[PDB]
Amino acid sequence: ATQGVFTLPANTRFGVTAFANSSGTQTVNVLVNNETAATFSGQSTNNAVIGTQVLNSGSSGKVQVQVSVNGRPSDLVSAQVILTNELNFALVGSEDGTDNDYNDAVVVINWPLG
Ligand SMILES: *C(=O)C[C@@H]1O[C@@H](C)[C@@H](O)[C@@H](O)[C@@H]1O
Ligand SMILES: [Ca+2]
Ligand SMILES: [Ca+2]
Secondary structure, rough: OOEEEEEEEOOOOEEEEEEEEEEEEEEEEEEOOOOOOEEEEEEEEEEEEEEEEEEEOOOOEEEEEEEEEOOOEEEEEEEEEEEEEEEEEEEEEEEEEOOOOEEEEEEEEEEEEO
C-alpha cells in the first residue's frame, strides 16, 4: 500500500519535522498538492533534527513525504493518529538499508497549530 501520503483538512497550517538515525545522509522532501514545499538534508546517528517547517495544506490538503539517501528512495512506513478527536499526528519511518530499524529518517507532521 501507499505510504507517506496524508489528506489534511484544506488550507490548514501544519508542522513537519525530520530526524535522522543513519550513517547515510538523509534527504526528506515534503510535497503539498504534488509540489515540493520543503526539503531537509542532514546526517545523524543520534536523532538530530535535520529540519522543521510550518506549511499550509493548500486547496487539496494532499501532503506527501519522500525520503532518499544519496538518491536511493527509502522504504516508507506511515500512519495517522488522532488524540481526543482533535490533535493529529502523521508519522513516517524509513529504511535505507537492510537492518530494518525504519528510523533512518523519521518525519512527524502535526496539526492544528496555533
Ligand atoms: C549503513 O551503514 C546503514 C545505516 O546506518 C547505520 C548506522 C544504522 O542506522 C542503520 O539502521 C542504517 O540503515
Ligand atoms: Ca536502517
Ligand atoms: Ca538507523
